[PDB]
Amino acid sequence: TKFPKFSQDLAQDPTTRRIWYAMAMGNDFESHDGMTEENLYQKIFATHFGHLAIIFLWASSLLFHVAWQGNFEQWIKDPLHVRPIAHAIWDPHFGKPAIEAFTQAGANGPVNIAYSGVYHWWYTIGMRTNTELYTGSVFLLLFASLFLFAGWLHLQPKFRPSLAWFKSAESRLNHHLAGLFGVSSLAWAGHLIHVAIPESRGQHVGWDNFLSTAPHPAGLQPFFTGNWGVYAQNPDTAGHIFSTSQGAGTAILTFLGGFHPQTESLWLTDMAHHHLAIAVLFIVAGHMYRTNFGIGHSIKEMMNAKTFFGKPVEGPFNMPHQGIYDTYNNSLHFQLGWHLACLGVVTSWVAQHMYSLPSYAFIAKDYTTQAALYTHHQYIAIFLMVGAFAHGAIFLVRDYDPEQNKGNVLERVLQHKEAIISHLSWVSLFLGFHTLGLYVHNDVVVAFGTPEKQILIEPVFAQFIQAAHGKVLYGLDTLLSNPDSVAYTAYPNYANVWLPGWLDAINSGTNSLFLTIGPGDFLVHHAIALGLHTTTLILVKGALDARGSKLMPDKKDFGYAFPCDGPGRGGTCDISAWDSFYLSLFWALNTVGWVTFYWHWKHLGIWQGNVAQFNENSTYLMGWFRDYLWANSAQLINGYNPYGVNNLSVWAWMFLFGHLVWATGFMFLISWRGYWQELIETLVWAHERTPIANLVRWKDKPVALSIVQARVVGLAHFTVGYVLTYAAFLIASTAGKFG
Amino acid sequence: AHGYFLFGPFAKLGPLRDAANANLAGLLGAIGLVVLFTLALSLYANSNPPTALASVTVPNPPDAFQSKEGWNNFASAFLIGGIGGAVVAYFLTSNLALIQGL
Amino acid sequence: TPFRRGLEVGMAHGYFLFGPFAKLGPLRDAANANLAGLLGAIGLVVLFTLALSLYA
Amino acid sequence: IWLSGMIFHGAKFSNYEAWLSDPLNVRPSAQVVWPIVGQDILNGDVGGGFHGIQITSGLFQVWRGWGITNSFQL
Amino acid sequence: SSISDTQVYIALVVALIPGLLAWRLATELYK
Amino acid sequence: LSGKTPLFAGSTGGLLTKAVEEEKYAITWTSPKAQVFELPTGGAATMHEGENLLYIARKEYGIALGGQLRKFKITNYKIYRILPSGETTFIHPADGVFPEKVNAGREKVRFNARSIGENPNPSQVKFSGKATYD
Amino acid sequence: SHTVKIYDTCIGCTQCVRACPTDVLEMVPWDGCKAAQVASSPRTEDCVGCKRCETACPTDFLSIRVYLGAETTRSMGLAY
Amino acid sequence: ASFLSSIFVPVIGWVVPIATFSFLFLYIERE
């Protein structure tokens, strides 16, 4: 039937299994029939270009609709009180009441309010007109076309890169760090200085006049001279109104270090100063390696080193890394598993900052965008983190060569993996028995009308971190809260210019910068501890046990994703390392759930000016049940009541939608195949023995979904329901109250 | 037979059933459904359909549906007759008051 | 083709049979006189088509 | 033992004798939890000067259908 | 209040250029 | 191929369209008595005193039946594979000796002289077109 | 389709052949001095893959494995 | 140019599914 074109085994399949499994392994080039290592890398390289194009085309969409169907110019004049528009609705199913409800934000038709926060990005970036967005949209289309042509080009025969070009790792670090990180960071300081910072001060700078008008009054002569202090002479005053010249200054680079008073965001002058310094280090960082000129460090030589100054050490930190370089470079799953974890951490790193240190103007007061953006990135951090171990497990199956490693660090981990998996189980058990029973003790004892008997304990040493940053509320008078301490007033160089601005922000109380933590904040971090240790326990186990176990020593021969080894020797329901991945997402989704509930309820108390309800009721779990879930769901469920319809009608429909998607998955998890195959065999009998429908007959024989497939179909249902129904609650609860 | 059958649900129960253009919506909606029904035949015909089965009630081989030609000719006639049945049902129901008014 | 023959034959007869029912049938002097001819003419076509398939 | 246990609680720890005086204002109770940690709350003012947990099995209505009017009979 | 009509058709015509190239890259990857 | 059908009224559980199109199977056995035996797909059926023959949709139905026949002390059961063109092939007791008992004429197939621990790793064998179980 | 591979730890218990629903395995004479019987898998095309052979093997780990692979009508247990 | 929504929306809901599922169903069933 020749549909797959990568596996003859699937094509020689009379059943419906071929259609599903074809969808599964179509991106799995390593499993494709007759795929050499050269063609593998070459096909992967071209695919990246098509992926990058999808990103820029998606970015072009945000600018086109906001320009064509949006209120950007209107929102700029009153950002706090005007609601941004994402795009326009056109649904023939709507009735007159629905259109009258969704006609909002001053639009002339049914329209969708925005919650991505691009309006606050595009205001801070230097854009002030719909036409400027249109140019960016058209530019990205051509910018995407540039990559799509490159992908086609690099598959042509004489332009196809060679295998050695891909494995030239020491060069790639040299260019990415210096060029992709550095120059892109250096360039961004240019736009901030030439476009954004002037536009914040009132002057209109564009392609027409950026060559003529200068950012600073003095030219570039102080830089080439070296008297760099000139650029930080006149900073923007505190009473500076954004996008105007009142209270403005001439400084392009400075280290004021605090928050802008009006926008309650970071100073753009610092962001320009910021990226410039980082680009210098990244460029400096780039020149480390051994690329063809000969001047630099060889990572392979550093890894295989066995000698310090005089002592014959086993390696770096006298640890044997004798075969880590070839391991990293030769196997792609090792790289992908590594790069995903690095990116997964950075994704959470973004989220942890953007609410505490908002960079974009007036985004802090848009309470809905601040919540959706946090919940967005953290969910993404999970998959990037959870996907990392999945590829680390795939590496140990189909790419790990024990003969090449032979006593390095990596083999040393597999030797004592029992201690790694065992001690993780103790930590996960040690946390949950104690974390839970404190919630249950407080919940019961509060239910018995004696809240004073609760086990409330203060996050002491965490407050020492906030007191270490200059928070006076706790009164510890530690580093940077004591004015006499050496860190507050640096003895050699009294150059802590960040101090007057930082202390004003952290000690304000209005912003979300290092908010107050109480006993309720304590227990939840240990719940978060339990999630992250246990997710690791599952994933670490499957990876290390992917190659073998006492139950199934020959697991590597079968592969990463196999269903089972049958019922023999006690039962082998879930042995594959794919199953460890499979059980982990059920946790990892819950971990951010525990986080996002903690982020949301803590902030709703602050935005509404009611901090006591969280600090008091967060201890007992009925508080999370009553004060957060029950109370905040009132406006959502009333989105479409029998007394009319309001703006929050999609969310209620989406709320019940994700509930249904969450549940239909459970069928594929609970109910397994053998029941369904027998059921389908009866339908085959009837269709073959019914009078008139006997004319029509399947070409591919219908069969029940495979065991691994139903696990795939079931978890997506678990996840899609999990994601959607909380987004509706997160947005509707926040939007209806507006904090 | 099917165009005459499919006109009813769209008209008396679809949107605009309580309007002046109710019966017209049934005719257009039915034709759009007949076209999809016609398209389905062409795909099942142009995909090398295996065979037609013979059961007890139809003991002999049923018909010459054993090839692409038999199903393709079936599809062309479905659109012709299918649209005809709906157009018939429209003129009767729209002018049923007149036919009784005679 | 056999289908093309009957269409040419039927289009003639359908166009012919409208006349007697309209002008000379009942309700010939009324607003709906021409409408009665359309129904009666189609009636014979159904009966005529029945005899054709029946004879077939 | 179960069935005999239910009617026994109705005999010793209950308000059935008082419930017959006013079945519309006194709620039925036959369970009493001891004054130990925080759980005396469950013995609220169920009615009839008795502090106990309110019952929903309906044994009180059955005994009235059986014509039982005093505790010693139960 | 919104982009002019003529600018919309221009961006729409421009979108064909990624489309023809996306089709070319995609069919080439199949081969 | 010869024999008598077991006497039963019929059953939906049985032969389907696959038999006409591809590879129907058959099973033959001979019994001295005429007992009642459960069929492979539901129901019960009697068996004649000589040369019983039954058509089955798969090979698993026959050996499952043959195991039931061994309860009645019947050990001469032969399974065939009837193709749509009428080609029949004698399969299950491929030699006169049953599979569980040894016969000299047979040869070992898909035998690995090594133990499972001695098999190579997958990384040692990738892009070659060979598997670890070889 | 599903490959059935036998290893040298066989001891001629014959418990694998008796468990086969489809008669895939057949004992054969071991020419060496181990025993007069060692298993084989001639009719591997009919391997449905129910792993009954593995549950019946008395070794520490198996003398006979069943590595799943491509599917067919005979392997998927389809009577239609 | 709000009329474009009346032409481009149903193309995504009706024309694109019909054309894609039509070709794919024939492609997967080819021999």
Ligand code: CLA
């Ligand atoms: C019968 C129920 C129903 C139906 C059929 C629709 C239909 C629609 N609504 Mg809608 N809506 C409904 C109820 C319904 N609504 C209700 C109850 C509400 C609440 C009052 C709304 C509120 C609402 C809003 C607010 C909006 C819509 C919009 C839309 C349109 C989206 C069209 C589009 O972009 O392409 C289809 C959309 C897709 C996302 C594609 C499918 C996505 C799948 C999951 C992934 C795609 C890959 C796929 C799996 C692979 C196979 C496909 C192959 C071709 C590759 C569409 C006409 C939007 C609109 O006006 O159109 C722009 C819009 O903004 N609706």
Ligand code: CLA
């Ligand atoms: C970002 C980099 C990246 C890359 C390059 C890959 C690449 C790969 N992964 Mg991987 N992965 C990643 C991230 C990545 N993944 C992440 C972040 C995770 C964690 C979730 C995983 C988890 C993962 C697992 C568990 C496995 C892979 C596998 C694979 C390989 C096969 C892919 C496949 O089967 O086709 C893709 C097939 C699909 C069916 C993908 C689409 C399915 C989505 C989930 C459908 C969602 C439904 C719908 C669209 C939503 C509707 C919305 C509703 C409201 C209407 C391939 C090499 C597999 C393998 O065997 O590796 C060799 C394998 O077992 N990966």
Ligand code: CLA
């Ligand atoms: C015993 C049953 C029976 C019945 C119920 C009728 C009924 C009728 N005959 Mg009739 N007829 C019968 C037996 C019967 N006939 C027999 C046995 C003979 C032979 C002698 C005749 C000879 C005869 C003649 C010669 C005429 C009639 C006419 C009529 C109609 C005149 C009504 C009127 O007042 O003016 C008219 C009132 C109207 C409301 C207009 C009527 C419009 C027609 C009947 C609509 C028919 C549509 C039809 C069902 C389409 C068929 C297709 C369908 C099978 C799928 C009436 C419907 C007269 C006529 O012209 O009818 C059109 C006429 O000229 N009949």
Ligand code: CLA
């Ligand atoms: C995403 C794209 C999309 C779009 C644009 C539409 C659009 C429409 N849907 Mg729809 N639908 C969709 C997806 C979509 N649907 C999906 C995915 C589902 C599955 C849940 C549905 C389920 C659905 C139902 C169940 C119903 C609709 C109906 C309708 C129509 C209501 C219009 C109105 O106000 O009342 C009607 C106003 C009128 C003026 C009469 C409409 C006349 C029709 C639309 C004419 C169509 C002509 C046809 C295409 C002719 C083709 C012939 C040619 C090929 C030769 C409208 C045309 C309703 C309907 O009855 O439409 C007929 C209806 O009952 N839809």
Ligand code: CLA
């Ligand atoms: C200066 C030279 C240079 C440059 C600019 C690049 C650039 C790139 N190469 Mg490349 N390459 C080079 C030299 C270079 N390479 C050399 C010499 C070799 C041979 C040794 C290669 C071999 C090579 C391969 C084999 C591949 C690439 C790939 C890529 C792309 C990576 C994906 C991407 O866009 O990441 C973008 C990344 C960034 C912009 C920065 C890092 C990400 C951080 C997290 C963002 C910054 C933080 C900030 C807060 C984000 C804010 C966002 C804002 C919107 C708010 C990228 C376009 C890959 C690709 O995509 O294929 C086309 C690929 O497969 N290159």
Ligand code: CLA
């Ligand atoms: C609310 C539901 C829930 C709960 C409570 C747990 C709890 C647990 N899971 Mg888990 N799990 C769940 C849902 C849940 N899971 C779901 C939906 C999935 C997806 C399939 C998984 C997948 C999963 C995997 C894959 C793994 C776990 C693991 C664990 C354990 C981790 C150790 C720990 O945190 O110690 C805290 C433990 C508790 C809080 C439970 C202790 C029980 C109570 C508090 C005390 C018992 C006294 C009792 C009340 C009195 C007896 C009364 C009498 C009638 C008998 C723990 C037992 C991991 C594990 O076991 O490794 C150690 C592991 O590997 N689970």
Ligand code: CLA
């Ligand atoms: C499954 C239950 C169900 C039922 C019964 C209905 C019923 C209806 N829907 Mg609806 N709908 C449903 C689920 C259902 N919906 C779901 C799940 C959604 C969410 C996507 C919607 C979304 C929706 C929208 C958005 C709209 C409707 C509309 C309608 C109405 C018009 C139906 C129409 O035009 O179809 C035409 C139907 C056909 C052409 C096929 C009819 C099949 C017949 C009845 C088969 C009979 C078989 C026969 C008895 C057996 C033969 C035996 C033989 C031997 C003789 C009607 C009241 C429209 C409306 O305005 O409502 C008033 C409309 O616009 N629906």
Ligand SMILES: CC1=C(/C=C/C(C)=C\C=C\C(C)=C\C=C\C=C(C)\C=C\C=C(C)\C=C\C2=C(C)C(=O)CCC2(C)C)C(C)(C)CCC1
């Ligand atoms: C040469 C050269 C020099 C001359 C330099 C001069 C004279 C000009 C330099 C021009 C350059 C190099 C400009 C950079 C152009 C790239 C731009 C302007 C755009 C990047 C946009 C991106 C990537 C996408 C942005 C997006 C879009 C489009 C949006 O609409 C919203 C934001 C976001 C989504 C991010 C000097 C004398 C120094 C030294 C000698 C050599």
Ligand SMILES: CC1=C(/C=C/C(C)=C/C=C/C(C)=C/C=C/C=C(C)/C=C/C=C(C)/C=C/C2=C(C)CCCC2(C)C)C(C)(C)CCC1
């Ligand atoms: C009693 C009974 C029954 C019932 C029946 C029924 C219910 C029926 C159906 C009905 C139907 C379902 C009907 C339908 C019909 C239809 C028709 C009547 C058609 C028409 C057509 C036409 C006339 C057309 C024509 C045309 C064409 C084709 C083309 C062009 C145009 C025109 C229009 C000319 C049954 C069998 C079930 C069972 C047994 C008993």
Ligand SMILES: CC1=C(C/C=C(\C)CCC[C@H](C)CCC[C@H](C)CCCC(C)C)C(=O)c2ccccc2C1=O
């Ligand atoms: C219902 C069910 C079935 C039977 C399910 C079948 C046959 C699937 C039928 C679904 C049809 C194909 C419609 C699905 C359409 C989807 C909405 C879209 C899928 C198309 C994507 C490729 C876009 C199993 O085979 C099974 C196996 C193992 C554990 C649990 C189960 C199980 O629960």
